[PDB]
Amino acid sequence: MEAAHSKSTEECLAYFGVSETTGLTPDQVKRHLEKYGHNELPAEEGKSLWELVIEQFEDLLVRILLLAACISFVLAWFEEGEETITAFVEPFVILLILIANAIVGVWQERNAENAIEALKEYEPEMGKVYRADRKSVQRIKARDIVPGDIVEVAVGDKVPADIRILSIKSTTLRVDQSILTGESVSVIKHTEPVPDPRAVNQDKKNMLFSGTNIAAGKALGIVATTGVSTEIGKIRDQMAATEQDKTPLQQKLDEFGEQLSKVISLICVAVWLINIGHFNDPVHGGSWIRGAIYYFKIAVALAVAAIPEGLPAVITTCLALGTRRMAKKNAIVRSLPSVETLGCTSVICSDKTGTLTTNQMSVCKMFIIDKVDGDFCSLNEFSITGSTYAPEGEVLKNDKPIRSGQFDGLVELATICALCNDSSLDFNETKGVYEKVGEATETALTTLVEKMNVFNTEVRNLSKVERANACNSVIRQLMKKEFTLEFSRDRKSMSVYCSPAKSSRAAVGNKMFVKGAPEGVIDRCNYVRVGTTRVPMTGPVKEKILSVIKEWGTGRDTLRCLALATRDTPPKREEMVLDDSSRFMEYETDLTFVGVVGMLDPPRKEVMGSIQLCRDAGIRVIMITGDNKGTAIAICRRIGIFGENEEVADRAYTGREFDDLPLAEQREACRRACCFARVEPSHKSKIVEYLQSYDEITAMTGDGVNDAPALKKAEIGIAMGSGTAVAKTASEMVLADDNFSTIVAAVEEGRAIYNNMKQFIRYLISSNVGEVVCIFLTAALGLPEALIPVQLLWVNLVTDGLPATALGFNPPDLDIMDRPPRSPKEPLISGWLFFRYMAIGGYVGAATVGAAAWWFMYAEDGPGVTYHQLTHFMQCTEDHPHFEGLDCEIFEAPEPMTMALSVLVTIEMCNALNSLSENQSLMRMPPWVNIWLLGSICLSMSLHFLILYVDPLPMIFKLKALDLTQWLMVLKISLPVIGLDEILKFIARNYLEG
Numbered sequence: 001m002e003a004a005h006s007k008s009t010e011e012c013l014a015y016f017g018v019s020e021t022t023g024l025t026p027d028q029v030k031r032h033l034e035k036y037g038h039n040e041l042p043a044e045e046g047k048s049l050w051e052l053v054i055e056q057f058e059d060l061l062v063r064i065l066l067l068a069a070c071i072s073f074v075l076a077w078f079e080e081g082e083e084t085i086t087a088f089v090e091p092f093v094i095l096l097i098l099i100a101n102a103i104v105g106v107w108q109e110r111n112a113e114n115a116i117e118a119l120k121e122y123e124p125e126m127g128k129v130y131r132a133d134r135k136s137v138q139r140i141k142a143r144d145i146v147p148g149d150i151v152e153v154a155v156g157d158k159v160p161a162d163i164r165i166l167s168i169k170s171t172t173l174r175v176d177q178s179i180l181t182g183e184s185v186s187v188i189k190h191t192e193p194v195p196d197p198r199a200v201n202q203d204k205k206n207m208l209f210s211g212t213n214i215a216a217g218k219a220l221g222i223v224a225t226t227g228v229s230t231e232i233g234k235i236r237d238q239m240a241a242t243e244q245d246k247t248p249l250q251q252k253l254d255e256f257g258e259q260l261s262k263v264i265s266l267i268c269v270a271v272w273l274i275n276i277g278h279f280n281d282p283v284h285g286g287s288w289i290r291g292a293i294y295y296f297k298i299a300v301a302l303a304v305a306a307i308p309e310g311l312p313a314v315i316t317t318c319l320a321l322g323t324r325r326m327a328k329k330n331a332i333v334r335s336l337p338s339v340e341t342l343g344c345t346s347v348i349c350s351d352k353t354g355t356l357t358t359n360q361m362s363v364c365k366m367f368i369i370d371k372v373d374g375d376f377c378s379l380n381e382f383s384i385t386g387s388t389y390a391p392e393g394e395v396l397k398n399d400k401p402i403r404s405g406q407f408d409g410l411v412e413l414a415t416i417c418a419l420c421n422d423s424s425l426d427f428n429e430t431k432g433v434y435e436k437v438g439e440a441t442e443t444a445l446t447t448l449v450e451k452m453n454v455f456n457t458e459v460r461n462l463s464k465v466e467r468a469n470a471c472n473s474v475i476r477q478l479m480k481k482e483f484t485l486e487f488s489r490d491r492k493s494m495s496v497y498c499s500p501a502k503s504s505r506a507a508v509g510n511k512m513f514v515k516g517a518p519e520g521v522i523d524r525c526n527y528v529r530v531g532t533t534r535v536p537m538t539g540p541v542k543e544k545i546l547s548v549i550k551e552w553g554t555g556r557d558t559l560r561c562l563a564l565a566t567r568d569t570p571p572k573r574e575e576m577v578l579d580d581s582s583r584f585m586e587y588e589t590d591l592t593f594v595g596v597v598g599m600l601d602p603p604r605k606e607v608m609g610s611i612q613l614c615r616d617a618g619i620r621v622i623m624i625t626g627d628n629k630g631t632a633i634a635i636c637r638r639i640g641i642f643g644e645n646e647e648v649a650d651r652a653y654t655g656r657e658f659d660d661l662p663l664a665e666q667r668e669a670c671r672r673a674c675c676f677a678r679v680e681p682s683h684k685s686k687i688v689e690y691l692q693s694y695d696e697i698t699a700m701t702g703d704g705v706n707d708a709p710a711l712k713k714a715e716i717g718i719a720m721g722s723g724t725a726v727a728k729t730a731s732e733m734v735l736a737d738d739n740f741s742t743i744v745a746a747v748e749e750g751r752a753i754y755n756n757m758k759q760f761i762r763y764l765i766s767s768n769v770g771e772v773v774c775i776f777l778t779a780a781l782g783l784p785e786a787l788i789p790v791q792l793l794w795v796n797l798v799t800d801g802l803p804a805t806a807l808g809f810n811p812p813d814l815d816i817m818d819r820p821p822r823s824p825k826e827p828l829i830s831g832w833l834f835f836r837y838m839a840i841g842g843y844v845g846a847a848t849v850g851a852a853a854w855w856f857m858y859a860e861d862g863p864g865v866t867y868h869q870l871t872h873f874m875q876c877t878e879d880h881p882h883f884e885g886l887d888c889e890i891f892e893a894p895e896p897m898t899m900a901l902s903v904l905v906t907i908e909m910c911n912a913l914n915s916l917s918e919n920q921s922l923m924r925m926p927p928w929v930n931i932w933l934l935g936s937i938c939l940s941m942s943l944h945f946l947i948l949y950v951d952p953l954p955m956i957f958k959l960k961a962l963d964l965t966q967w968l969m970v971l972k973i974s975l976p977v978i979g980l981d982e983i984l985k986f987i988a989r990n991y992l993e994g
């Protein structure tokens, strides 16, 4: 039953045809189970090991790697019978890289939480029902509860389904339903229908929601909806159905592997076409097995050279270390890759209470009526010092302190505040700080009354624990609180009914004290209190009352205002029905205005500045709050979002205003808007999607289970540290200090991280560019493998990997936050910079093979056909005559390979330095800015020297230490890469566009 809140007790009973005193019949339970199913959220979306390791291998680069291991593995079964048992080292290493990969992908799963699952925490195991088999109640599995069931609940129970309350057995019934929203004050529940069929949940005063807790009471009810059709159920489905896009980096990396795969193919075709003369070779002889070996051993060298195998491990290290840096600055990032999307944030929607403000309220101004005389009006305005909940502070009239007792309106205004109050105080001794007992806005009142000793109580010597509620107690001794009328949003007020507690204080009989939103209660006033006396309410006084309330609320004071009033002649107790808020507004009429109180919920110290950072950074900030639109605009002005005298007819909106727009004007409103007041939780998701439709990158704050779908929908979901468990698991980020300024600090760090990450990505990819040219020449010129795949593996995982990591620690730019947000559709390498890495990879591929060629041809340690005929080395074991009067196994020598490899390793340290900056010279930007990177270069060189010298390792790498004269050539060959980039950099700034 969808609309159970809008129906009568009887109607719901009749809908399912069940009797409240008997329950459902076994047959009716059979039938209701097959119609509505069991009372549970769907089982989790199943994944497994066999399905998890395959996911690791449905990447494309890793697929190609896997194939490259196979060929290598067959190759390690045909090279020679005994040339090298290190034939087997190649394929077994590639597998490790895949396995290591596979392993990590799954210990990142055995740890990751699910928000759909975090909901289940709010499903209770058991429930209680009455049914027709038994007179008495039976405890059963909440799983087996059905719509139409008669259910019982009491203190401490978790609510099993969504239930229409039938009868409240106890004298009252309060419910904790903060699991939905966040605010923990329990709320009164009633039995009568709620007329509006499109009522929001806060107004469903007669419903109990699955997942909430009973704070006080015992109630019988009938089950309206179960499982996925509850309110927490309707959120599970919004959360399941919402699909998160990939981060723009994953998006780019995916596009990389897609193009890399087609490139490799072009190169194979090319290699084949250049060796199409091989078809003109004679048929008898040669060695097909040695041709096929060669076009295969070059085929795998082509794969491990193309792919930046170290890259995912480097990205993940930067993120993980950035993450821990960010936790130092109060931001707890949940998934590593969202650090990239965070820094891209173009729009921020933050809640106001608690995040833009301290949620620590106290009363600042207050006024009573001093005199009424026709049109002539005089208010009596006051100010109050002290910003905390502590009773330290004083009242002033035009800046001189006053003794509040000599104002009679003041003693009355005091007692309303103390009596019309469900909250209080208790002094904490471990912190030495006064904290609040209930609601913050009421606690401000209970604090205000402690500052105006209306009865001038000698309190100048009291113990602090007993100083907590001293002035309030004397006002509790005066009137017994017979009962109270709870706050509801139709009438936006609350009240209490009181009787005097003595026999000498027992004057004037019974009274109602009233507080609420000023429009509503002032419209219900026909009298005005001037001191002890009383006078009929008029125009001139109502003017000069709403006048001051508009000033206090829409002024640079930005104050939250309550009107306070008494009903001097309340109805007789027997003529009030207390079980039905429908009548509570009518009970609270014919009032006497006593005064108005104005409190502040202050901005946080750091918020002012973070918003200017956002302007500097091209980030739109959007406030979301509960204040009336008028004071909402005013707080925006005070925190910098708006200018003081800047027109905002079209950049603020209430929910009521937002809905009354056709869907067209709604999308457009979200492009301009910077303020939303009094929203319905559904409006957060709408706002996101509209923002998304402009390719915005949106950060959204949220607190409770009913904020989860918008949290999961925004590009960056932001939860509060003090928020629910569920909202934390639905968010990409958690604020340990609930503070907005933390968000802005996270955007800053996430921009500083990507600009570093930007460079080591560029760095590693370029090396792979260079490697592939080395390989291509090898195959196109007809050269003995200048670089074996096993070596390349070392270079990409270890030798290159260390500078790349140091590069995540580049000093941040001074102007990180003075630039607009980065377009996600921005390529890493493009236009001119593409032409530049095309030239540098061009270099490297030539220098590497030329180091092998040099050692073969023009060098001292090996004769080699200067006539270039070395080329035909595969036909040396037979064609000794044809300009080859020398040896043959020399073309598998380690020495010319280490020449190549050393030239590669040395070249890559140089390129890491050129990579400290995209376009700035090293004469403008020294290498010793990144000290951690100077340091790591020294490390890899050692490891080069390690695998060149330590007896087990050179045979493994087909390597061989080279002497002083061979290092000098290695430097000669490699050192010029610095000079090459310094020139292309010179072009970038001085002659193209920039």
Ligand SMILES: C/C=C(/C)C(=O)O[C@H]1C(C)=C2[C@H]([C@@H]1OC(=O)CCCCCCC)[C@@](C)(OC(C)=O)C[C@H](OC(=O)CCC)[C@@]1(O)[C@H]2OC(=O)[C@@]1(C)O
Binding pocket: 252, 253, 255, 256, 259, 260, 263, 264, 267, 306, 307, 761, 765, 766, 768, 769, 772, 773, 776, 827, 828, 829, 830, 833, 834, 835, 836, 837, 838
């Ligand atoms: C990595 C290994 C190299 C060999 C390669 O294939 O990369 C190409 C390709 C993948 C693109 C290119 C490379 O294109 C070439 O170098 C032309 C082919 C040369 C023929 C070889 C025989 C002489 C990148 C590498 O070239 C430069 C010059 O660096 C830059 C960039 O890559 C990036 O943006 C990296 C993504 C973070 C991409 O153009 C990229 O594809 C596009 O989708 C981008 C946007 O990705």
Ligand SMILES: Nc1ncnc2c1ncn2[C@@H]1O[C@H](COP(=O)(O)OP(=O)(O)CP(=O)(O)O)[C@@H](O)[C@H]1O
Binding pocket: 353, 439, 441, 442, 487, 489, 492, 493, 494, 515, 516, 517, 518, 561, 562, 625, 626, 627
């Ligand atoms: N304890 C109380 N007794 C009577 N009226 C109260 C009250 N607390 C708040 N109000 C009044 O109720 C009006 C409606 O505000 P509501 O109380 O529903 O929201 P809220 O202040 O908790 C919103 P938010 O989501 O921003 O924190 C306010 O304008 C205020 O004048």
Ligand SMILES: [K+]
Binding pocket: 244, 711, 712, 713, 714, 715, 716, 717, 730, 731, 732
């Ligand atoms: K999200």
Ligand SMILES: [Mg+2]
Binding pocket: 441
């Ligand atoms: Mg409130």
